[PDB]
Every structure is written in C-alpha cells, then in structure tokens.
Amino acid sequence: GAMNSSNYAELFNNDIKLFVDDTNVYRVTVHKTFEGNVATKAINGCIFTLNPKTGHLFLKIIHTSVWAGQKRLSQLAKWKTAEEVSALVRSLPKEEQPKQIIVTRKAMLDPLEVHMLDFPNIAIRPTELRLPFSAAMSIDKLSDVVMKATEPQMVLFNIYDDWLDRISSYTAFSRLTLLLRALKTNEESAKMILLSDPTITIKSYHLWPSFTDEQWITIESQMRDLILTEYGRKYNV
Amino acid sequence: MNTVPFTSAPIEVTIGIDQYSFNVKENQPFHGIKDIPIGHVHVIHFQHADNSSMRYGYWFDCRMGNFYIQYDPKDGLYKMMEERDGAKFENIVHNFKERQMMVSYPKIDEDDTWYNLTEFVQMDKIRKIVRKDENQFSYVDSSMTTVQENELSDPAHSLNYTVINFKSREAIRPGHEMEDFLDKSYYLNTVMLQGIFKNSSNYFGELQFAFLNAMFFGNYGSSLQWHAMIELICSSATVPKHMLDKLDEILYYQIKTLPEQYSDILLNERVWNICLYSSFQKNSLHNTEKIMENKYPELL
C-alpha cells in the first residue's frame, strides 16, 4: 500500500524498487506576448527515477520537441512519464526489474498502472511523504545537462556519488533528502553552504563535494539549522 | 395472462412480483398470482418474516413452461418448480381461480414501468448468466457473488456477468495507453459491442438485469456491473446516437423506480457525477440528469 513514515525502512531492504517523480517532466516559463496576452514557452525536463538502495539514478531527459502540436500537456506528461518508465523497465533483464515502483504524486498511479499491465507482478505504489526530489534541478551539473540537451537522452549514474563505500543506504538516502529539502527551501543559502570552502572539490562524476566524514557532519547540521531557520522566516515563530 | 400458483404459504413472507409486493401471513389461504402479463420476463422473489437476511427470487417467462411455487421445509424456502403435465396444471389453476385464492398482478394500464425496465431482458441470456440449465427459470439471491468477484468461491452459484475492467489489456491497446483509457470507445465499440455482445440490445439487457438484481436483492456485484456498464458508455467519446438516446430512457426508469430510501447504497457518487458532469456524454442524458437532480440532489 501507500509508503509513509512507518513502512520507511522498506526502501532499504533487498527488494528492487524505484521511485518516480514527474514534477520536472513538463516545465515552462510564462511571459507576455506582443498583444499583451500571456503565453507559455516550454523548456527541457526530466523524469527522476531513483533506486534508493543502490543510489542508481536513471535521468530521462524530456526534450521540448515531445510536446509540439500536443494538447493538455500537463496531462500528457504523466502518460509520457509512465511510457518512459515502462520502456526502462522493459529494457532491464528480468532479475534487475523492480518489484515495486513508488510514485511521488498520486496522479501517476493510473498512467503507470495502465502502462505496466504487462508486468502484473510489479506493484505500483503511492507515498504519503513530502519528498523533495523536485529540487533535483537545483543540482548545478544536472541543470546544465538537461538544458544543453538537443534530443531525447537518458543519463545512467549513482546519486549518492561514493558515499555507500563508507555509509549505509538508509543514511545515504537521509543525507540526500536533507540536502534536497534544503535546496528547495532556500536554494541560494543551501548552495552557499555547500561551496563556502573552495578547497573541497566536486569530482568529475559527482554532484556532492568530496567531504570527509567529519566534514559531512558540519554540513548536515548546517542544513538542519537552515531548514529549521527557513521555516521560521516563513511562519514568524 | 398467466399464472404462478402456490402449493401453500406455510411461513409468513413478503412476496415480490416484478415491482410489486404484498404481505402473506403464516398459513393464510394463499395460492399464488394470476393475470401475469405475457410477453416479458418476470421475477417472483421473497423475504421471510423472520430473517430479513437473504432476499431470494426466480426469474422466469410464462412462455417457457408452467411454473409453480412450493415451500420446502428441509431447505427452508419457497421453491419454484415446473409442472410437466399441462392438463394437471390448468386443472389446479382453474380450481384456485374459482375459489379465488389468487391475488391479481395489479398493473395499471397507463403504466409501462415494467416493460421499460425489461425492454431488452431475455430469458435465454439470463440463463447464460445464472447457469442452472436443468431449470427453465433462474434463481438469484442477495449473497450471490460474481465471476469478477470470485477473481478478486463456488463457481456454480455465481453471477457470470461480462467482465469489464478499465485497466486491462482487453480495454487497453498497446501504444494507445493514454488514448484508450481516457476514451473507451475502442473497448466499448469493438471489444465489447462488436466482440462480445454483438448488438446494443444484449448489452442493455445485461445492464437491465444487473440493475434489477441489485434493486430487488441488493446484490452487490450486480450493482457494480450496472455502474460498470453505464460508466463504459459515458466514458466513450464515440457512441451511436441511438444507443445514447436509449440509455437515457433506460436510466430514467431505473432512477424513477428506485426506493428513495435505498438510494444511498445503490447509487455510486463517483460514477454518476462523472457520467452526468465530467464524461463525454455529460450533455447526452437529459432525462436522466433532470430526474437525478430533482430527486437525489444530495448525491451531487
């Protein structure tokens, strides 16, 4: 059933699962037209599909050409998301296919379920969690790649860089979501936090700096304080 | 005019005949129902005075035999039976009419209610849904489940309605996933009408029997079928204009005939607010929309 604060450790068991967030599939800028009306222009997006256990993140770049001549685009995005997830699943060998797929927005249950009918033994689940994966486009190199894309294209990598070599997947996921949730509440600050020290570099194939364990703690604390802070500034508490 | 005599009424029971019903008191002299219109299917059903649990009934057609009711005290219930000896049968009936121990099917002449509710209902189809082929009549009760319900336990005592499932491969063609699901014309027109039902009338009969089984026995799977078969049409952008016009009448009489106080279990909020106000056919059920809003505005 639904994924929530209780059945939370099920993410880290050995059942192959993926999360799917579609929030950045269909993105636009709103602008004025010469005649004073409003119009949307669309920009590249991205289906965020994440194996929370291994750290595998298969980005599916959505090129604005996919929309051309289409109506009800916010609705089609969800169908297109599920078309792309299905196609991913179908390309993996049997023993690598996920047993569950959890969507971050209940709107994706039907599109997906329909697209997956061929895979009756794959459970499609919602979640009750407020998860911050939409901030994924606040991670610099990902913003440049999705934007620089000229055609549909899929990136294969790991979203925890090399962390698992020293920490477990539960902790790895918790660090991910903290940084994401901070990037969402106050991107400028959250990013200022991550880069203040110019000697701690980001590797060629990494999103996060090459912190030490000691350094990760400072950072995590600071992102805590930030998320607690940025709440106050809002609710004046 | 035809007749369903009773051997007797040993137990207090409420008897149903089509949309009518009357109280019979334990060992009152009652011997059945006369003047039953020839030309339509009918349903005699029963609710014992003790165990309001389990409404049960038999569908039948006087064209297909002489039928009588006989209470069976091992099994506890009024049983329908066919009399093969036609002469024996006329004799008994005449005996009971002369003594006047039969109530009369009480139809008003202006009233097309029963016809409208059974326009496309045909015994042969019912007997394919309630498989019990040694009997020319077909037994149904509250607790019977549907084939689709036994897939989500005894298969002989099931209601074998046509399986409709919007999130199935039958419903959904490869590569048209979003198209087929948001607009079920394919499913409706080719899979179901051309494929399984053949014509609109068979579809509508299943739909009318589903509804009557729901209303007379509160059979829950029947109700789900009814709303299912409604929903498919309303969710299809391409329907024959004649089928839309007949549906609107079909639903009108159903809604007209429903007990005001049974409405809250038998009308599915989602399906109706979708059909009437969201689906492709929101504008196409004028009679159905008018009576729903004047009678059950609370549901909307």
Ligand SMILES: O[C@H](COc1ccccc1Br)CN1CCCC1
């Ligand atoms: O393209 C990669 C860097 O980008 C990523 C790195 C790891 C995971 C995902 C991405 Br996308 C190589 N280059 C170094 C910096 C510029 C790009």
